[PDB]
Design a binder for this molecule. Structure first.
Ligand SMILES: CCCCCCCCCCCCO[C@@H]1O[C@H](CO)[C@@H](O[C@H]2O[C@H](CO)[C@@H](O)[C@H](O)[C@H]2O)[C@H](O)[C@H]1O
Ligand SMILES: CCCCCCCCCCCCOP(=O)([O-])OCC[N+](C)(C)C
Ligand SMILES: CCCCCCCCCCCCOP(=O)([O-])OCC[N+](C)(C)C
Ligand SMILES: CCCCCCCCCCCCOP(=O)([O-])OCC[N+](C)(C)C
Ligand SMILES: CCCCCCCCCCCCOP(=O)([O-])OCC[N+](C)(C)C
Ligand SMILES: CCCCCCCCCCCCOP(=O)([O-])OCC[N+](C)(C)C
Ligand SMILES: CCCCCCCCCCCCOP(=O)([O-])OCC[N+](C)(C)C
Ligand SMILES: CCCCCCCCCCCCOP(=O)([O-])OCC[N+](C)(C)C
Ligand SMILES: CCCCCCCCCCCCOP(=O)([O-])OCC[N+](C)(C)C
Ligand SMILES: CCCCCCCCCCCCOP(=O)([O-])OCC[N+](C)(C)C
Ligand SMILES: CCCCCCCCCCCCOP(=O)([O-])OCC[N+](C)(C)C
Ligand SMILES: CCCCCCCCCCCCOP(=O)([O-])OCC[N+](C)(C)C
Ligand SMILES: CCCCCCCCCCCCOP(=O)([O-])OCC[N+](C)(C)C
Ligand SMILES: CCCCCCCCCCCCOP(=O)([O-])OCC[N+](C)(C)C
Ligand code: NA
Ligand code: NA
Ligand code: NA
Ligand code: NA
Ligand code: NA
Ligand code: NA
Ligand code: NA
Ligand code: NA
Ligand code: NA
Ligand code: NA
Lengths: 69, 69, 69, 69, 69, 69, 69, 69, 69, 69, 69, 69, 69
């Protein structure tokens, strides 16, 4: 029940983080394609957005470990 | 049961927070790409929106920990 | 059974509230992008909409805690 | 089972209400952006629509409480 | 089992009713935006449409109570 | 199991009926917005379409009651 | 397990029938809006399409009762 | 397990058959609206497509009864 | 378990076949509407695609009976 | 469990093959409608794709039989 | 449990392979329709893509057999 | 449970890798269709992307085998 | 349950990682197709975005292995 739990926490975190990052990176690539002169600003939004999106998934990863250990 | 419970809360909190942030950040990137002069304006809305969206997932994270410990 | 319930109430509340906020913020960002002179109007709509959207998820959080304590 | 029941009721009510409100609020923001002169009319519709949308989720929340207590 | 039942009926009725109303309300907001002259006409369709969509969810709420009592 | 059954039948019926009505009413609202002179014509189709869509849901409600009683 | 059976069959039939009719009616309404002259012609297609769509859901209801009785 | 089985096969047959027919009828309605002179040709395609779509669902309905009886 | 199994195979085969036929038929209708001159060509493609699409669902039906008997 | 396994394998293969074929045939119908001159080359593409798409589902059907027998 | 396992692996591999192939082939058909000069180039990409997409599903089929034997 | 596990890991890996490749391949086909001059530039992106997308699915295949052995 | 756990974490991480990469790679291909002169800038974004998206899935695989061992 600890294994099963740790899996669910980690698995959902993976899905959460990957997809969120993908959405953000994709938006960045599309934006940069549309407006190459906005390279920097768009790259900044990506660099701010990604960690924000990963925050809660990262915490869920820690919780997965706490369950396992 | 506490392991499984803690995993469900944290896992759904991860999905919730990550995706919500991605939607907000993507909207900010797209708006910025369309009207670069609004970059500060949209950034401000992102900075307000993200914590608002992360609030409940964060509380579910705390509940996840209360279930575990 | 209590751990499982608390998690389900909290996890669904997280998904509900985060995504609802994201939808509202996204709309505010898109509206402001189209009509920047209306940002104050749109912000007021966002600041009314968000708590209204968070209302039931918050009660579900409370219900989650009542299950645990 | 009272715990699981209370959770399911509260969790679904939360998804139900939050998303319903968000959809209505989004429409209002989109409409107001598109026709700023209609801002009062659309705000009235939002103020009528939100309670209507929340009516059944609220009743579900009460039922959630009746099951828990 | 009665608790679980009452929760499912109430939770689904909530989702059913909330989303149906939001769909209807969103439509009259968009229509009113496109044709402000049809404000009263569209609003009437909203006031006819909502009870109809809420009819079965309400009956499910009653059924939810008959299971609890 | 009768409680579960009555809940599933009533719950699904609610989702079925509410959404179906919403789809029909939205189409009526959208049609009326495009063709204000066809208001009566479209309202008639709505008044014909709603009971047909509700027919099986209300039958599932009866069955929900039969299971409960 | 017969209560569960009668419920699953009735609930699905409800979703099946209600949604199918909604799709057909909405199509009739949209078509009439697009080519009003064809109102009667489309209504006949609606009156033919619905019973055909409701046929198997109706059989499923009969089966639901055969299980319950 | 026969009640449950019969219900699964019948419920899934209902959804399969109803939605398939609705899709074909919607297409016929949409096409008639665009090419009124093709009315008969399109109506014929509907009268061929429906039984073919309904073929397996009907068989599944039979199989449902073989389980129930 | 033979009842459940047979139900799952038959039920999924019904969804598979019915929906696939609906998709193919819809496409034949839309094409015919688009180019009435190709009415027989598209009709041939429909008469070829449907049996191919129904192939595995039919086999699944046979397997369903082999489980039942 | 052999009945459950054979069902799941056959049912899923049914969905897999029927839908894949439908998607390929639909595309063939739309291409032909759009460019009737390419009818031959598109029909060839359909005759290559369909067996390729049905391959693994057919293998899964064999496995379904092995499980049964 | 070996039967159930083999079914899951083979069933999901079927869905994976069929749908992936359908996606790739559909793209090939659409591009060839728009630019018939490239039918050779496009068919080559289709013939490189399909085995790649089928690789892991094929492995899952092998694993399905190892479970069975 | 080792049969179950190995199947889940292989099945999900199959869906992951196949769909991922299909998406990437489709993108390559669409780009090549629009800008044939970029045929080899796009093909390189496909050859970088595919193994990157297959990475984690490959590891999940190994894990599937380790579970069985 | 360790087999179940290790499977769930690996399978979900597979879906997470594969889909995310495919989304980023696709966006890179589309962008490059539209602005070939930005191929280097877009490729860089792909090489930054991919490991960011794979980060949590990779961790979830490590957790998968920690469950197996
Ligand atoms: C019934 C409808 C018939 C429509 C026929 C329309 C013909 C139009 C004129 C033909 C010219 C098209 O030219 C098209 O250009 C691209 C480059 O831009 C070519 O180039 C592509 O294929 C060649 C041949 O393998 C590769 O070496 C090359 O690297 C690749 O980019 C295509 O092979 C060619 O088909
Ligand atoms: C349980 C595992 C299931 C995982 C399912 C993951 C699904 C992820 C879907 C993410 C893809 C969405 O991308 P996006 O950037 O919004 O663009 C699409 C929207 N526009 C076209 C309007 C731009
Ligand atoms: C189980 C986990 C499933 C996760 C599924 C996540 C999918 C989230 C959808 C991705 C975000 C959708 O794009 P968006 O920002 O709304 O804008 C789309 C419209 N425009 C681009 C034109 C503005
Ligand atoms: C298990 C948890 C699953 C969570 C699934 C989350 C999915 C959230 C999807 C929400 C996406 C919101 O897009 P949208 O409002 O349609 O954008 C429309 C933009 N325009 C109006 C300009 C077109
Ligand atoms: C488990 C919980 C799952 C939560 C899933 C949430 C789904 C929310 C989907 C809501 C999507 C937004 O749609 P909408 O704004 O009505 O229309 C789009 C606006 N236009 C009409 C202009 C295009
Ligand atoms: C677990 C339960 C999760 C429930 C999730 C429910 C999500 C329901 C979202 C329904 C939003 C639909 O909006 P709408 O007004 O039809 O616009 C649709 C946009 N177009 C008009 C352009 C098509
Ligand atoms: C578990 C229960 C979850 C319930 C989820 C229900 C989802 C309901 C979505 C309903 C969407 C209704 O959109 P629609 O009027 O067909 O599109 C209109 C598009 N045009 C105007 C362009 C024609
Ligand atoms: C348990 C889950 C139950 C909820 C399921 C709800 C399903 C409703 C899906 C939507 C049904 C109505 O869309 P429709 O008329 O085909 O229009 C779409 C086609 N056009 C936009 C071109 C007109
Ligand atoms: C309870 C589980 C089953 C309930 C799910 C019901 C699903 C109903 C799906 C009906 C929606 C599809 O409609 P349609 O007419 O093909 O238009 C499709 C045209 N577009 C692709 C442009 C939207
Ligand atoms: C129990 C689960 C049952 C789920 C049943 C879901 C059925 C969904 C069927 C959806 C079929 C939609 O495709 P289609 O109308 O061919 O595309 C039409 C696209 N255009 C209009 C632009 C051409
Ligand atoms: C129980 C499980 C049942 C699952 C049933 C799933 C059915 C899914 C059917 C999906 C059909 C997708 O059609 P499509 O032509 O790609 O979209 C329309 C594309 N165009 C706009 C170019 C036309
Ligand atoms: C239980 C198993 C259910 C499987 C359901 C699978 C759904 C069908 C697969 C996805 C079909 C849609 O994607 P696609 O054909 O690449 O693009 C559609 C055409 N556009 C490019 C215009 C969007
Ligand atoms: C267990 C059941 C699994 C079912 C999995 C179904 C997967 C369906 C994936 C469908 C992915 C479709 O995305 P896409 O074609 O890249 O975008 C379409 C838009 N454009 C190409 C125009 C840009
Ligand atoms: C376990 C089941 C797994 C199902 C996974 C389904 C994956 C579908 C992900 C792809 C869905 C959306 O595609 P996309 O690339 O964002 O295109 C959006 C169109 N533009 C690129 C033009 C913006
Ligand atoms: Na974007
Ligand atoms: Na946006
Ligand atoms: Na908006
Ligand atoms: Na709107
Ligand atoms: Na509307
Ligand atoms: Na229509
Ligand atoms: Na059509
Ligand atoms: Na394509
Ligand atoms: Na593409
Ligand atoms: Na893109």
């Amino acid at each position: 029940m600890a294994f099963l739990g740790a899996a669910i926490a980690a698995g959902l975190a993976a899905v959460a983080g990957a997809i969120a990052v993908a959405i953000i990176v994709k938006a960045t690539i599309e934006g940069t394609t549309r407006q190459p002169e906005l390279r920097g600003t768009l790259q900044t939004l990506m660099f701010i957005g990604v960690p924000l999106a990963e925050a809660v998934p990262i915490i869920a990863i820690v919780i997965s470990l706490l369950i396992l250990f």
